[PDB]
Symmetry: C2
Amino acid sequence: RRRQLIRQLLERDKTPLAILFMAAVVGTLVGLAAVAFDKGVAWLQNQRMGALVHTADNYPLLLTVAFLCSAVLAMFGYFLVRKYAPEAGGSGIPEIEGALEDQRPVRWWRVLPVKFFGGLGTLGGGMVLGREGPTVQIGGNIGRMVLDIFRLKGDEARHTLLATGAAAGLAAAFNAPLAGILFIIEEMRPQFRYTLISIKAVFIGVIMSTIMYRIFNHEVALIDVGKLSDAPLNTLWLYLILGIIFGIFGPIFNKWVLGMQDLLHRVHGGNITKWVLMGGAIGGLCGLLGFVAPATSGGGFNLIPIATAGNFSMGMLVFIFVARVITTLLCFSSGAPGGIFAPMLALGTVLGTAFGMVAVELFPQYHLEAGTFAIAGMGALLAASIRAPLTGIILVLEMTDNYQLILPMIITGLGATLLAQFTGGKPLYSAILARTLAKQEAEQ
Amino acid sequence: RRQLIRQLLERDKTPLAILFMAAVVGTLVGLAAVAFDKGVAWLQNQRMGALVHTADNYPLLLTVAFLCSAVLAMFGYFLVRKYAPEAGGSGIPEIEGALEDQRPVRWWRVLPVKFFGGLGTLGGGMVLGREGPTVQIGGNIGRMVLDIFRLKGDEARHTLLATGAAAGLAAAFNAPLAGILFIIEEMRPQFRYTLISIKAVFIGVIMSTIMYRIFNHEVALIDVGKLSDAPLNTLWLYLILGIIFGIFGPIFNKWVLGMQDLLHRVHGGNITKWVLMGGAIGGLCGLLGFVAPATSGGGFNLIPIATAGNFSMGMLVFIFVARVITTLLCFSSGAPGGIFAPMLALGTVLGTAFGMVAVELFPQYHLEAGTFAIAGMGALLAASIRAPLTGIILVLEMTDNYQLILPMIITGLGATLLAQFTGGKPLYSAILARTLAKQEA
């Protein structure tokens, strides 16, 4: 096999020009799609806000049209999924992950409109869900779409273009190109066997997607924390302790989101009507909370810079955390179209800040800024629950631009994954696919 | 399917033994890489002090410059040619082959040979980098503790070997991310599945990086400072630059390969002619390291200078050409030392050049040439070594100008694309192919 390796080495990295070009197309489409989705979610959230100002006097009435506006939008989302594409419920990343194992179908003709407009309802209603979920699944299906349209034959194309789609999808959701590619090569790709996924091609899609996003969202960052303070070497041991904290909470939050899927299933039993209604109730709750305590609802991107800057009180952080643990499970486990990826950034930033506050008072000699522990913990729930530390770390780096905290970020992230493993926890995205795959056999 | 379901449920459960051992591999590789760096610096400083002793008689001072490096070079080539021929060159191809279980990891020989051999070449001021030594050593160290603790299994032999190479690159650049990325983009077995625990590679990279921070804190290898942003209508220039690197990439690849052939004839494989040739090349660097220091050495010193646009266009042309020559002469000769880092200086210079032209051609873009330098900095890596993701993340970790990530990514990808389309190959895999085929023929 030495003679084969010599053949293989000399023929390394020669991605078929057809695949490379189609990667540029997939990315461009996924980009525009992810942009349009983002524009749509924003608009609906703005319309709801204008409505509350049509009734800004009568508080109980205003408390109602907040609920209703989100309730209806949620119902419309749950319905689009339960009727035309049951696979577009939940994150969508587990499904695209199953597609890469050739174990789950890629019904783009159905999911593309269902996920887009379905998430548009849930997200636009102000439910605690993320854009990645939709954009990654949409992105994958878009990648699959142009594979079928142009009829590109071969395993490489079906795996690549599907991957570049998912990557261009995560990238455009966060303006994080590197994090997109890294998500594919750390988490998304087939984890237990060799694959023919051209990284160079995945790149091209990610580029075009990112470029598209920059064309429509330039000069405003999703998260602006600003340059924080450095982290001394004698400070590092604190970030490991934080990781160990995320490390034991990770699997717990995992059991919850899974178990809550079970618990909420009984509420509707699988029936499209009880489910849509339950969705509207959950959706309406967020729209309500999105006015009476907006930090307990929504994507959470807004409270991240606030928490990092240390403008929240310890009690408020505890409130925001617990209240968001609740509104996250209720929104994701219900089966609503939307990722859990981004709301886990807000959950980490808060929990991290909390640690940072205690750390500040306990060691004035370290001259601590609690915001460093916020950034350290930001991609730590990802590290602990999703078990993709490298992606989370690079993501947070791409969003917060505080590279001088890379050691705290890596240490906390790795401490998370280690204790996540050692405490009998599993990658949330693969634990979902397993549940989905095994049910596909269970009912046989 | 039922297999996958079984596999999913058991995903990411790296054996605790491997995890713990990865932490020691990184710790050792870290300290080792640090000690190597401290050694190289020391020797360069001694040579400098010697030049001060005779800082009057210019021809004499031109001589003791040559001789000090000549001897140090000779000592380096000798240690390799005698006790470990595998420790010549980068060493990254060798560890790559080690991961394919197609080359042996003679740590008992390579560790002292590479360390002290590289200490000679690097400390002599030869245009070579620390990665080569550190990465190769790193892997052996990983292999060393595998043997010592007798960790059985394919996973362990592949993991600990990888975390070692990773910890090696990381501690050579203070770039933890780029280290892990190097293993998962370039180093690891490229054509089949492997049992390399990423989480374990991380732990080694951490501890290694931590060790480096413990001894080299508060001073960056490259400090450019925060540059200006890059407007969207400016992006097309970064593609053009990547296309330039994309066609020069393979050419520089033929040269490094071809010069290995050409320099072989000079010594025929004979240890004496070789060591003497090495001393001549090494002596040249020590000479050049005084008459035009930019034409010799690692090149890390001229990167910030070039990026801030303190060089003239002609000086850049000079530095480039003169460094293309001194890079080939140093790496192709078989001297222990990577070509990785001197490609950074080659990229930074070529980029700035492009940046200078771009500035005067389009005053409306309000350009700063230093942006194209950073864009081009990991572009030769992108073009010749064909590991763009690692190169881009490396430069990012070294220059901290994330607001140029699109230029950096576009230029890097424009490099790798044209590098492919112009019939070039991954230098590190083109070398392993050479070696592996010379073996079965």
